[PDB]
Amino acid sequence: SAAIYNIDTSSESPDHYLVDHTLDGRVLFPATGYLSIVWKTLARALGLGVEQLPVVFEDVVLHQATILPKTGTVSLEVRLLEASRAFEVSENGNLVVSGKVYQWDDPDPRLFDHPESPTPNPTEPLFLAQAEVYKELRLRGYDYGPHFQGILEASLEGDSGRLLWKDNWVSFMDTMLQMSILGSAKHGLYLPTRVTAIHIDPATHRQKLYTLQDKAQVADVVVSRWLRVTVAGGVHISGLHTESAPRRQQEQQVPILEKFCFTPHTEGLLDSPALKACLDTAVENMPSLKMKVVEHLYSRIPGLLSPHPLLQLSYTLLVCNPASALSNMVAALREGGFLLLHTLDAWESLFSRVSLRLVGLKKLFLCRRPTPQDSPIFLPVDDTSFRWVESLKGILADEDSSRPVWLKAINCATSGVVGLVNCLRREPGGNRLRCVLLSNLSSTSHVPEVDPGSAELQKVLQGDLVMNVYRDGAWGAFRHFLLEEDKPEEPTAHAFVSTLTRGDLSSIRWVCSSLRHAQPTCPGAQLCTVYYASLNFRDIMLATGKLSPDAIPGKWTSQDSLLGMEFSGRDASGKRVMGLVPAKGLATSVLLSPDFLWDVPSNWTLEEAASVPVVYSTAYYALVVRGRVRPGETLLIHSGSGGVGQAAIAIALSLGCRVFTTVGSAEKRAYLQARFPQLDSTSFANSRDTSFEQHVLWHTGGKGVDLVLNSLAEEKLQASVRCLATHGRFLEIGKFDLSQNHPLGMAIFLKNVTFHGVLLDAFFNEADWREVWALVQAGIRDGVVRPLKCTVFHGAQVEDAFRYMAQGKHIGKVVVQVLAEEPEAVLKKLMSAISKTFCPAHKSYIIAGGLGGFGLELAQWLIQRGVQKLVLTSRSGIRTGYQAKQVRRWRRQGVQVQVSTSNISSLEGARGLIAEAAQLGPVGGVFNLAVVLRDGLLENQTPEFFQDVCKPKYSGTLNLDRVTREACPELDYFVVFSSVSCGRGNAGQSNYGFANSAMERICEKRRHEGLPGLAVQWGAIGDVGILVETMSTNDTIVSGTLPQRMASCLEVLDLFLNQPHMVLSSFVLA
Amino acid sequence: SAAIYNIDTSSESPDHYLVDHTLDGRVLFPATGYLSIVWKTLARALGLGVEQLPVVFEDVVLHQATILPKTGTVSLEVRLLEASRAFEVSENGNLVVSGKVYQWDDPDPRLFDHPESPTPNPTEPLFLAQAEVYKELRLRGYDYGPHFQGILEASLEGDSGRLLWKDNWVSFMDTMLQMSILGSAKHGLYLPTRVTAIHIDPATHRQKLYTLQDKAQVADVVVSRWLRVTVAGGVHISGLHTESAPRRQQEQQVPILEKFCFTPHDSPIFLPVDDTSFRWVESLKGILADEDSSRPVWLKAINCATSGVVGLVNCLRREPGGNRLRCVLLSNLSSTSHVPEVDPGSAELQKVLQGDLVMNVYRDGAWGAFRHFLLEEDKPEEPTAHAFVSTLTRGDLSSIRWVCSSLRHAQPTCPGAQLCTVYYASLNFRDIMLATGKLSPDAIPGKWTSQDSLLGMEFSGRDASGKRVMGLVPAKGLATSVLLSPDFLWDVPSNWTLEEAASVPVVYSTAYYALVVRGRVRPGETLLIHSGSGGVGQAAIAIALSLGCRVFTTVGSAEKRAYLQARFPQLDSTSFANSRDTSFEQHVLWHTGGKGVDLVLNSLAEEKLQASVRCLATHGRFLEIGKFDLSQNHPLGMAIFLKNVTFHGVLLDAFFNESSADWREVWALVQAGIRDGVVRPLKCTVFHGAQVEDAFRYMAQGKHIGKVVVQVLAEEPEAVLKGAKPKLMSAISKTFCPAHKSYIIAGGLGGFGLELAQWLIQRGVQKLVLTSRSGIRTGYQAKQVRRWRRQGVQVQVSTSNISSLEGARGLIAEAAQLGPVGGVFNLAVVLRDGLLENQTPEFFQDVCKPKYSGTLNLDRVTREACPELDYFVVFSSVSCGRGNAGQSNYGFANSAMERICEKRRHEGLPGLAVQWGAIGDVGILVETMSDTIVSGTLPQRMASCLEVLDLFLNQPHMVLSSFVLA
């Protein structure tokens, strides 16, 4: 019969380890789980056990992924064809896995021998530990749980390592597959789809397992990328073919983005940031997380307070939108409560009569009832030595006393008192003990300071607001405002077309390109001004998500878009040219070698010239170079009304060749008849079904065609092969059958048939292209290369062009005109594009703390954004294997990344660091990610903790500020990574909040003077960091906030770097 | 899961009709039987009936043939993979049929529309009847019984017809396949092995059926070989592939071959049978009426020396009253005129009567009788300068011998063809596969007859001018002489030897083709050659090293490794891998840096071909010169073409069909390589032409390195020897005919007449004159005659009756108009059966007019005006030698024919009388009678009949017999 496996991933279920095989947030059945169940079925059929049956899997193809639900059961049916040696796995009648499985009759232990490494004896003392290996895997989208974490150790290149054996054949072989992708330079999720051959011999597997000092038996895994073979224990995976799996948008966390900006106390309104500011002020001035609010304000206040993670809201603070009513409201409100009244001298008099003190004015009236307090304690937190923390502990150590303690920062305007107070407010000492500050942050020296011991601070006590900051005359405090949802745009002459969300044509926008921040115009490349950029089928396959971006050959990062393979326009000299590019051709400008450039003749329009390069190069390479079309031959050209088909028709008819075309429309028949008069009514067939084969065979006298230009697939491809004549040439221009490894029956080759896999894409990564270029040029001179039909969409209608030519109704080529041709001469451009952060290759960028968790990922992101001169500052240098691997990759791929021990906490250290950066090139960016943690309750806090926690962040940022101001006139980025702890408050880390707030003040001062400045209030970071590596596993709720993923973190950083705001925040709600 | 189908061929079993699907004497399960079984399994799985389940079969592959035993049951297990749409038929765990089966979701009745014929049928009235269709099929080896005889009618071209419907799908689709293979130029037993797609829609099948006047449901069948499709009713077979299954050597037709040579040792009734009016038949009947006085019946033939009453006495003895009559003959068969006539009125007659011998015939002073002697089993060997190597029995290297070539009995002379004496002929892998039977003769392209031997693909020797040349031929290279076009000849260089040069033409042509013309190898390209120790591998190594290419070679032994290292010193230790394993792939991928190799010249198979494909680099070229994976249609993963990889199916044998400038490119490449020294001949192990069998078995095992060369003639020391005549060597005699001579077949439109005509065409006859009183009537005759005419033979269908002397003279003149009369075959026969009691002198006259008088006139006219006559063959019957019930006249005519032939041979003229037994598969016993015992003898099959006739035509005996005992 059929063996049925009810896959239950329940707690008491004997297959519960499968819940730990999470990929992109979905529990997927492992590719090796199918092998295990097929092995079990074969053992049952043969009467043996799995451990007693060596097994061989051949041509294993995984047709779909099985999603294991949280609750329920998935039934997988394994059917064996013993005579055919084949198997199949079905979920609900749908084919899941197919291939050949059979008993290994003569098992060879010599097969499971580790092949010699291509670069043996690396002499590398640093390796990738298990934690680092799975951190790197998680960064790529592999959320493997503890049961599938079997790589205890691996080399930095992923070519060798150690595999933990846990009496499991699914987990061990899945870790074997993990090792095969650990060393891959590809980015993103890669799932196994085809494996050429898997050999499992448990007999030699048992003898290859050796126990460690832990007493857990392990094996040694080796990945030979040259041989395409993975061996570990008694398993030999050969020919594994992983295919990119798109990362689902559901797993993409949506973060809350806010800007930290100073808000004066004294400044339609319901739907304005003033209401949010008042609500946040009330939340800040509160004993605990309980929010007792009594009231059309029910539709805004709960929504505005919802982003706050720890706020417990009880909506029925007093909000309303006369003397007796005010008295009743005051009586209802408790001591220290806030009354928020919205209405269109009399109001102030009524508030005074009701003993209400106004603390906010938005022109929304904010009133707070004074609370009886004794003489306050004045503690200056402006001491550089942090000697004030001892007095802070002394006053806050008396739990019995409720006397207010007013902190003051009258000096050192860059004082981080805000974050310190934010963290103290939720600490058990100081929740109601009034740990209130007062900061005089003068952004300009012209504005005079507020003298102490005067009426201004008396008004401060009168208001009794927890946060009181004097910023350029006005009195207020810093507060969080929701960031604008719109992506910032700038007028740029260099832009490109990108799909912001993969697979969505409506997401197509023009984005700032990397050809403006860096323009390294040198021989071998040319910054060509694109006038017309045509679309190809690959562009839609990319923009609709049907084709993975990495399937395009060439070194492409995970951020850049690859839309457009061809353009026409101008040159640096101004000559009218048309060029062929591997990608990025759908842009305002393209950097391209002159080898892939032609000269547009005088008669040709620039618009019509924009359809020739891709289509005619493809046709020439397929027909002349590869197909070797002799004159007078017979050709079957599929999709002859398309681009490549039309050029092949023109080329063949230039040689006087009999042509058979397949078109799916009578309109396309008419168009081809009109375009090429030499075609006969018998020359046209149907491209939407197989009957073209019967048409060709009948009209060729059963002989067939000498050439086939096949873009069709499946049964149409098989019929096209059947159309071949003796000595016939088959040119495969399509990719579906090739990508799916569909079986081509090897009996057509008995007709002296040559099968061509024609891909005009290796010309951009390997020379021989000059032959095709010369052929295209010669066809241009002879008139053979004729411009195609061009449907024109302007630059602003790129989405319209994409969704038009996706319908398939277009005839010829669809052209996106970027810049209109000027009729003034044939020898003699601003556009609002989304701001994307890009960096010149000639500038140096410093990441203090760049060897840490966020530091390494930010460095990699900067590399992908064009940074070629990088300086990473660490207090200890390279210690971990992960850091060594990342720095090694960056150095190998061409970047001048330099590790420096110089500490920014010292001014001389910062000067030396800036000098080291300037040695490579001008300092274009400074990133302060240096951090240490002395987290603990205030009673355990010591001044030395404040010194050593503020030196990495506060004094380091001050030194970076000074040195950049005095030696970096060309600096473009000054980014410090603060924390949401500073923004709102995290009990147990007060000095951390102080350092972060001081960095925020430094950045605000920098931005006020017109210098670059940016402070990012980061929430918990998920993939890497300090809290994740130490303790936090996966995504646990931390202080009401989910740990943000690195992909979202880098996207948010890209967004933040293109905003005029001084300080912005980012976190993900639980 | 597995649906069990116990196939029982017992009479009570529902599957008893399967006994009628006999092929080559074996009851085979039809391919359509597998189709119906899988269809039933799919219907059961979907809970439907077959008639309610339109079905599609795809990529049906038949891996083995199921033999249905006479006693017992064969169980076929069918397992369905619905998810993958695949099925599998297994018998005792062995895979039989695999493919894709699924329900036709959208049945299109427009699919079952008969395609238009490429040309209109001119002979619409002249079609092939059911009897003719299955007579032809049985001749090809298809012994279809009544249940599988569903082709009611068929056109001569075999592209259309009608199929009878018996509510049986297996029979209907089998007849569809039969109609598909009916119009096939290929001869032999062809069985389906692969079908691309089969669409069965019973819904439109019911509509397509129609009822004739016989109340029998029929369906029109159309076969389109241009579209490679066959449509009939609601069945659509596309891409049917049939491979010629060799006919089993366990042929029960082991004829008893005998000679007929003269063997010296109441009231008497004398009846003179010498009268030419046969008026004595009534007297013989009156004599046989009596009982007592009829004991001494002494019928004497005195006047005519070729009276032939021997058959009269033999057949009349079997009649009731023959032994009682004791019929005794006095035949004065004086072979020479100078011999004295034995007087029948003297003491000689008294002595003959006293002897009482059953048969007494006088022959030049000897009183004897005609007796049957067993024919010598030794094949006649003759000294000829034109002989070829052939396997007498396929698959047996022991049965390898030299047979007289077609050039000996037919010397051709025409521009564009050269007759070159062969000094050294080289064995090739295809030759070994042909001799061992692993390769069918039909796999080699060309127009090859059934008896044609295709051993030998390459040779070296001297042309007609005496120049030293080595050439390449499609086949027949293992001969003492080769007739080939000059475009396939290379001049042997002075420093080369004929033995040395006899290794280049195939090996280096193939290597140069595959590498340069197909592979387009460029200098410096990493290149992988499989089996580099063999010929083609060695040539590819030589070419690649001449181009300075890095070479990876796979060899099966360390000795071959050492030989390649010594021969090509440019190969390092890292250039060699293992060909008997997959490890060459790992070796190549490691030593190439994982990139691959730019070219792969692969002759390996199965996993060793997939590994080689995996060895390919980006822009790699795969040159597939092997055939196993090509012939088996093994799947090839198409993801390799994502590496810009070109896959070449390289077959050098395609150059012998067109011989255009495409071959001239390879010829120029080989000549240039010869003149630059790139083409260097391989090591040759030489076996003398006397012993070719040991060469075949030596190279079959595979220890040989380089080439195995058979030396036909030792190269004499000279440059251009004027003579160049092949040495006279003894070879098995084979009947061949000049192309310039005309051959007459009296009664050549009959069954045996048509078979002999086809055999003569296969033996080189180009001018045929078939005679028939009524001309062409049957569609089989028209099809055969038009096929011969289209082949190029001048076939003349004359109505000149050989009964009259004037008619024979006109027939001979008609033949001489085409060309000199090289041979006359007398097969004209009319039959007037019945016992002697119900017999008439007119019946004797009618029966003897075609045979007795026909041979009279043929002998006379050939003597007068046929100096170049080589054959005078008449077909007698065993009924003459022994006797048949109620066939006295037939025996008399046959014996007269035999006497005529004996006299002709005695006078030195050609003459042959064949006493045929029951003739099978065609003729009179096939139409009138029904593998049925006739007079204790089985009907001899026509393949055996033609083989025995070939044996007889090369014998010195006047009369021989052939029959098969039951």
Numbering used by the authors:
A (entry chain F): 858 to 1124, 1217 to 1244, 1251 to 1271, 1312 to 1316, 1325 to 1347, 1375 to 1393, 1400 to 1802, 1805 to 1866, ...
B (entry chain E): 858 to 1122, 1410 to 2074, 2077 to 2112
Give the published text.
Fatty acid synthase (FASN) catalyzes the de novo synthesis of palmitate, a 16-carbon chain fatty acid that is the primary precursor of lipid metabolism and an important intracellular signaling molecule. In contrast, Type I FAS found in eukaryotes and some actinobacteria are large complexes of multi-domain protomers that are composed of one or two repeating polypeptides that are each encoded by a single gene and organized in a symmetric or pseudo-symmetric assembly. In humans, the FASN gene encodes a 273 kDa polypeptide that comprises the catalytic domains necessary for palmitate synthesis, which further homodimerizes into a pseudo-symmetric complex. The contact point of the condensing and modifying regions is the neck region, a flexible linker composed of two short unstructured loops which allow for continuous swinging and swiveling motions of the two regions relative to each other, maximizing ACP accessibility to all catalytic centers. hFASN is a validated anti-cancer target and is over-expressed in solid tumors including those from breast, prostate, liver, and lung tissues.
Denifanstat (TVB-2640) blocks consumption of NADPH by the KR domain in both protein preparations. However, the binding conformation of Denifanstat is different from triazolone and piperazine compounds, with the Denifanstat being more solvent exposed and interacting with residues from the dynamic loop predicted to be involved in ACP binding. To the best of our knowledge, this is the first cryoEM model of hFASN complexed with the first-in-class anti-neoplastic inhibitor that is undergoing clinical trials and can be used as a platform for rational design of other novel hFASN inhibitors.
